Design a protein around this ligand. Structure first.
Ligand SMILES: Cc1cc2nc3c(=O)[nH]c(=O)nc-3n(C[C@H](O)[C@H](O)[C@H](O)COP(=O)(O)O)c2cc1C
Ligand SMILES: Cc1cc2nc3c(=O)[nH]c(=O)nc-3n(C[C@H](O)[C@H](O)[C@H](O)COP(=O)(O)O)c2cc1C
Ligand SMILES: Cc1cc2nc3c(=O)[nH]c(=O)nc-3n(C[C@H](O)[C@H](O)[C@H](O)COP(=O)(O)O)c2cc1C
Lengths: 265, 265, 265
């Protein structure tokens, strides 16, 4: 809201709607992690830390009053700025239906890639552990279309041992998926065989990872914690151009790593 | 209920709900026998024996008053104890969403494997005869995907001879199933061909057996008799830890072995 | 509440009321800091951190997506255990009006002294800065009853420069106060002259500090942040005795150090 200073940028309401609409479209398809994790919040611009429900004891062993500090995950605040040419935006008022927003588009994709980098590969300085670091959840079959279907059936038996119900979802690197389709030399559609072995599951292709993984979407196992959802604000004018910024506050927690299986081809 | 002594364990209601929930999830997927047998009861903590409807005659051949004893199946009571660390459980109150229940999980899987051992392999001392001991219900085709489909069509013709209607269900070792899928080198999905040859039946993969079997689920042929369903109780504290236990009372009876066919690969 | 496990200690309701009453009486007079700071909360047993409203920037200077971590004060959780003799407590049921609670009293005073140690001298490991560390708020007159009254008039003129209204309160070491009364050799009551120079203020004597200070009580300048207020719980029995514990979660923040003046005699 008001902390974004939007009402001080020299832009008409229609020009704000054009900027917001384009950013929303791109975030919808490029925030790959949000396609299968749980999203909590938003808790607001002031939210600073998410409790871990532990105490780190700091007193000496023989103190009458023993004490320690409660532990929490600090939220990450990101800010990515970009400039738009003001004359080009004014053509929207003249009726132009395709004003150039390339700088916005470039920045939106960098932010999307930053968030997915935390979800998948974690952030040491913030104490976030990403999905791909739970190495003990890794199984290894091979690099052949048959190897993939077997790995999926094995994965669902491992889930069964831990009492993890479905629905189940395969997340797989885009190029790998394409390579698997090429091998299947004119046959029953591989995509259909995969949905079957997932017992009616989903397939999400992505460039964010190099192999694949299987997750349960029963809910409550992967939590994206949002303070402020992705928003666009105003910084300052710089003659002919307006400097805007994208911002959000968030952190991430793998609650139950049993709902996760890493596939190594 | 009250015989479990739950209200004497030093645990909050929320901590009891966490223990119970996790055990329920695992029992749901690991009690393989319950997925296709009939479940009678529960008849209560006091139930001691299930009548067989026979008399064993013990008098001599030339007695005026002839007599014998009614026969019954005695119920099996099992108890499996395990300890939980009390400080770790108290973190649940601090807001921790993933307290460590590994000891519970380990014990729940041992109990699940005990029950399935009675259903499938029987219990001589209790007089239970398990599914896999009815050797006269065994047919033998071979170890090839085609051999399996043929065996299923033959099985359903044997059921027809005995007047056993469906729906029919294939229970098959997990590794065997995976091996059958590997052989079927990129073709129409084997799972679809199997459901067809079962006339719209079901497939249950399991590690509890080494080959496979086909059963009718018309009802009334395989009875799991429950006194007390699986429950968690409290035994005693032992400094920093609470000793809990899992318990149930039950027995098992194959009423109509005609509703059962054993496959030998 | 339920996380304190109170209902598992073998004590009657009347015996709990006796323990709680005695602890309350002592905390009322021995928590000296609470006599003039603001008390926020309680926010609950789960509260873990209090936001500072800042961001620590961690990205490199030339990154497209710049980022950092929100900052907060982690709450301190303290726990102090103590044992009570169970036979002695049972005399309360026999009608005894003065059962021996010396162990409770000793522990309550250690906890009270711990909290006041944070408020006055801070806690480096938790990042709390105590009242007595704001050295730039220190003025120095001398060690004579006249020096004290002058220091107070000077203090209130310094407050006026910063726009800090009253009412004003003098916090002074007990022995110092007694020494000032001895010097005033039979005259108009020093306590009356001090209240006058404070413009109708208050005097709080305490052993927690070695000199004195003057604070405004306008409100909103010294915040004690409470998660869980001081509470008594149950740990375990140990034959003839019950082991109880005192606990709280809290932190402290000097918001406006202009509302504070340190006196050095
Ligand atoms: C996380 C972050 C937050 C910032 N927030 C503000 C702000 O609220 N007000 C301000 O005047 N400058 C702020 N700055 C400094 C710059 O003026 C500007 O916001 C710019 O975004 C700097 O970083 P960026 O261009 O990479 O996004 C912030 C910088 C960072 C790195
Ligand atoms: C089937 C079985 C039932 C038992 N029932 C009780 C009981 O009801 N009360 C008791 O004090 N001890 C009982 N005990 C003895 C032990 O105190 C405790 O229950 C423990 O469970 C022993 O067996 P376990 O640890 O393998 O489960 C039982 C033991 C077994 C083997
Ligand atoms: C801050 C602190 C919190 C503790 N909380 C628990 C708890 O919640 N449950 C438990 O079984 N033990 C807990 N312990 C460990 C001991 O069992 C017991 O609580 C005891 O209080 C140890 O510290 P103390 O005697 O100095 O208070 C805690 C210990 C500390 C130092």
């Amino acid at each position: 809201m008001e902390f974004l200073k939007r009402s001080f940028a020299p832009l008409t309401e229609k020009q704000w709607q054009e900027i917001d609409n384009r950013a929303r479209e791109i975030f919808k398809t490029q925030l790959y992690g949000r396609k299968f994790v749980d999203v909590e919040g938003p808790y607001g611009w002031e939210y600073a830390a998410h409790p871990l429900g532990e105490v780190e004891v700091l007193s000496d062993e023989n103190e009458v009053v023993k004490w320690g500090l409660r532990k929490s995950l600090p939220l990450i605040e990101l800010r990515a700025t970009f400039t738009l040419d003001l004359w080009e935006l004014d053509n929207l008022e003249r009726g132009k239906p395709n004003v150039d927003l390339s700088s916005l588009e470039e920045t939106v994709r960098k932010v999307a890639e930053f968030e997915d980098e935390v979800i998948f590969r974690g952030c040491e300085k913030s104490g976030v552990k990403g999905l791909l670091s739970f190495e003990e959840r890794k199984i290894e079959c091979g690099s052949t279309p048959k190897d993939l279907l077997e790995a999926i059936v094995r994965a669902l038996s491992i889930f069964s041992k831990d009492g993890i119900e479905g629905p189940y979802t395969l997340v797989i690197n885009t190029d790998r998926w394409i390579n698997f389709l090429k091998e299947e030399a004119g046959h029953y559609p591989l995509e259909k065989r995969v949905e079957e072995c997932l017992r009616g599951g989903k397939i999400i292709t992505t460039p964010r990872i190099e192999d694949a993984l299987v997750v349960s979407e029963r809910g409550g196992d992967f939590k994206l914690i949002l303070g402020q959802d992705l928003s666009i604000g105003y910084e300052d004018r710089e003659k002919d151009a307006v400097r805007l910024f994208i911002t959000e506050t968030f952190t991430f927690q793998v609650v139950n790593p049993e709902a996760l299986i890493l596939l190594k081809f």
